[PDB]
Amino acid sequence: SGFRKMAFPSGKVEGCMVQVTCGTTTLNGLWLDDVVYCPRHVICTSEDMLNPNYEDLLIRKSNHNFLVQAGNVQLRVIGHSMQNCVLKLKVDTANPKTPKYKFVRIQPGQTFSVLACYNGSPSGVYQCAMRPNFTIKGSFLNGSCGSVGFNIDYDCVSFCYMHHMELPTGVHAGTDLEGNFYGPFVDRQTAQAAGTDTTITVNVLAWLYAAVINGDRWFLNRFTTTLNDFNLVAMKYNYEPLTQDHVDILGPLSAQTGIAVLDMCASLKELLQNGMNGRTILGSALLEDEFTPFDVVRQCSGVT
Amino acid sequence: SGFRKMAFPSGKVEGCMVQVTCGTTTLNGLWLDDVVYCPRHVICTSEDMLNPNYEDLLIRKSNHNFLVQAGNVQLRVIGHSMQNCVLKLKVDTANPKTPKYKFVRIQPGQTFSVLACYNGSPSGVYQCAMRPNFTIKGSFLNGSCGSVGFNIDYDCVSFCYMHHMELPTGVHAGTDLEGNFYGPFVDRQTAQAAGTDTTITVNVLAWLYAAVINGDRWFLNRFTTTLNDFNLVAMKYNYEPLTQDHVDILGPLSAQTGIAVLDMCASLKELLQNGMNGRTILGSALLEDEFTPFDVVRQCSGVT
Ligand SMILES: N#Cc1cncc(NC(=O)Cc2cccnc2)c1
Ligand SMILES: N#Cc1cncc(NC(=O)Cc2cccnc2)c1
Numbered sequence: 191s192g193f194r195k196m197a198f199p200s201g202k203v204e205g206c207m208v209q210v211t212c213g214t215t216t217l218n219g220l221w222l223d224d225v226v227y228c229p230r231h232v233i234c235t236s237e238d239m240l241n242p243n244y245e246d247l248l249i250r251k252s253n254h255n256f257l258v259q260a261g262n263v264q265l266r267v268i269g270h271s272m273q274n275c276v277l278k279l280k281v282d283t284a285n286p287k288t289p290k291y292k293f294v295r296i297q298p299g300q301t302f303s304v305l306a307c308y309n310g311s312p313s314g315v316y317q318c319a320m321r322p323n324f325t326i327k328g329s330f331l332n333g334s335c336g337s338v339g340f341n342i343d344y345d346c347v348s349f350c351y352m353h354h355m356e357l358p359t360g361v362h363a364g365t366d367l368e369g370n371f372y373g374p375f376v377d378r379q380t381a382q383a384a385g386t387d388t389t390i391t392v393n394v395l396a397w398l399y400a401a402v403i404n405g406d407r408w409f410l411n412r413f414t415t416t417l418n419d420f421n422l423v424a425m426k427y428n429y430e431p432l433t434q435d436h437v438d439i440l441g442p443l444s445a446q447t448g449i450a451v452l453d454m455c456a457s458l459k460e461l462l463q464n465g466m467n468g469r470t471i472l473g474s475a476l477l478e479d480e481f482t483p484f485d486v487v488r489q490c491s492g493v494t
Numbered sequence: 495s496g497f498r499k500m501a502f503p504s505g506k507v508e509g510c511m512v513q514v515t516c517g518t519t520t521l522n523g524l525w526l527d528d529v530v531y532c533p534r535h536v537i538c539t540s541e542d543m544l545n546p547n548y549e550d551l552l553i554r555k556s557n558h559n560f561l562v563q564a565g566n567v568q569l570r571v572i573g574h575s576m577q578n579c580v581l582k583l584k585v586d587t588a589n590p591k592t593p594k595y596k597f598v599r600i601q602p603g604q605t606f607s608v609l610a611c612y613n614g615s616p617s618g619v620y621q622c623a624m625r626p627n628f629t630i631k632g633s634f635l636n637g638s639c640g641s642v643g644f645n646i647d648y649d650c651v652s653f654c655y656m657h658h659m660e661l662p663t664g665v666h667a668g669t670d671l672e673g674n675f676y677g678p679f680v681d682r683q684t685a686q687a688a689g690t691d692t693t694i695t696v697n698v699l700a701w702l703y704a705a706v707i708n709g710d711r712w713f714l715n716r717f718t719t720t721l722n723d724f725n726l727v728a729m730k731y732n733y734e735p736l737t738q739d740h741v742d743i744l745g746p747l748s749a750q751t752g753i754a755v756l757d758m759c760a761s762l763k764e765l766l767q768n769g770m771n772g773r774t775i776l777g778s779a780l781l782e783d784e785f786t787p788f789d790v791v792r793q794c795s796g797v798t
Contacts, residue, residue, distance in 0.1 A: 192632050192660075192666065193633055194618075194622075194632065195499060196617075197501060197618060197620065198618060199505075200505060204505040308796045308798050312505075313792075315503055316499065316501065329496040329500060333796060334796070360496055361496070466779075468769075488617075490635075493617060494613065
């Protein structure tokens with residue numbers, strides 16, 4: 191028992207972290223096979239970041255201008271290319287610690303672990319979620335760019351995020367491993383505001399099921415509701431609308447606890463209308479939306 | 495910016511995890527050099543756990559009865575001994591992935607990362623704290639015993655916890671790497687109640703400084719207090735008494751923000767007396783006590 195914001199073991203990702211330097215700019219890179227992936231703004235000076243033309247900036251760069259260090263040793267760069275907002279630096283050595291991996295573009299509401307890195311070295315690991323406004327609420331300082339977000343299925347690492355920037359609001363924006371930004375963000379030092387941060391409803395419901403499994407049952411009520419009635423409440427509280435797909439994915443949690451999804455929705459509805467009244471659920475005084483139904487099942491069953 | 499419950503990168507610890515089987519009981523072990531450390535209740539059957547005599551139970555066990563598997567390969571056990579509540583299984587091969595390590599017994603209030611494991615395989619990593627009642631609020635299921643808690647200084651892993659049990663209250667109890675339990679717990683299937691769970695005051699104060707650094711300043715007030723006045727409030731709210739040692743360790747955070755420690759104590763006092771009034775601090779609706787002053791500085795400066 192007990193429920194924690196748990197990250198995947200980071201070992202397979204630590205073995206992929208390198209340092210990329212271009213001129214006076216140093217950030218993190220991800221070395222998989224003979225390719226090093228990093229944000230393209232590594233070629234920029236703070237003056238360039240105001241309005242950068244990456245195609246023109248890259249013309250003045252050769253393979254020898256990209257310095258890639260893996261731990262203590264230097265990698266030889268034999269190729270360089272730009273794919274959307276990431277640079278792919280072909281090196282002459284395959285990473286001997288390359289795990290089985292995939293590049294996946296996640297949907298908003300999905301969760302992932304972040305391995306925060308500085309100068310190619312890992313500093314920490316934490317669990318995150320791609321928000322419905324396509325930002326992440328991470329913990330990154332200057333130098334953390336190139337840090338990656340990922341998921342793990344037994345021995346396969348699915349890379350889903352690469353950190354590029356921090357918005358003036360303290361929230362973070364980044365790309366998938368093909369260099370496409372999540373959301374409308376551009377890799378430019380220009381004011382970019384994030385849209386409405388809505389609550390991931392299916393994840394809060396998954397977390398209420400995790401609380402029921404762990405003994406926290408005070409919020410269970412004698413009521414039920416419908417998808418349309420629940421969504422009227424969800425809209426009012428800036429919650430994501432619940433669909434039959436969401437109900438379907440909550441099926442195993444509903445089966446394990448014997449609490450129908452629409453019944454759990456009615457508990458959530460009352461919690462939204464009345465608040466927690468000074469109580470806590472899984473040691474939290476607010477409704478947690480950064481655990482997917484998959485995360486709850488995984489943690490509650492011990493998937494390694 | 496951003497502040498997260500961040501765990502240390504787990505790679506160095508993943509390379510130490512093995513599976514230990516004795517009879518029909520399987521739990522986790524920690525392989526460092528030529529020694530495998532695991533909870534001694536691995537020699538018990540569920541019948542034995544009611545009232546076990548480990549010295550008598552160990553008499554019926556030989557080196558060949560302890561099965562140690564590292565990944566997919568079997569380790570040869572050439573020695574076995576009991577040190578307090580852990581078994582040390584001498585194996586014929588030194589772990590080639592043994593990092594620089596220490597065994598440290600932590601004080602209550604101190605934090606550590608846990609690598610939850612099942613059948614010698616890591617499932618997840620999370621940040622934890624040794625509570626003042628010597629329990630941890632972890633996330634462990636049956637099979638997680640032998641999972642370890644640790645801290646990391648550059649390349650050195652300080653092992654501080656080994657998980658042994660879950661109390662009927664859903665909180666966890668365990669030992670240091672010399673087999674001594676934290677708190678008064680015994681490795682027996684007998685009802686053991688934890689004492690009062692008090693709040694780690696110096697850690698809440700460290701977290702208020704992290705919130706000030708990250709932009710959350712609403713709780714800052716026009717007041718100050720004294721150590722004796724603050725502690726009258728702290729006692730009333732089951733908070734740990736604050737000492738000059740605590741004030742001393744908050745010195746770098748006080749210097750960085752320019753907010754005197756006693757001033758931050760007065761903000762904490764008002765937060766305790768008035769509550770958050772529906773507001774949040776670092777995305778939390780309660781006062782977080784599982785970040786030490788060291789954790790705040792580390793995360794806010796990017797120590798790798
Ligand atoms: N793409 C892009 C891009 C555009 N403008 C500025 C930057 N730089 C940062 O945001 C650095 C930073 C600072 C704190 C946390 N995470 C990152 C990058
Ligand atoms: N020492 C000891 C000891 C005494 N009595 C019972 C056990 N077993 C467990 O608590 C197994 C377990 C279950 C869930 C989470 N963590 C562990 C061990």
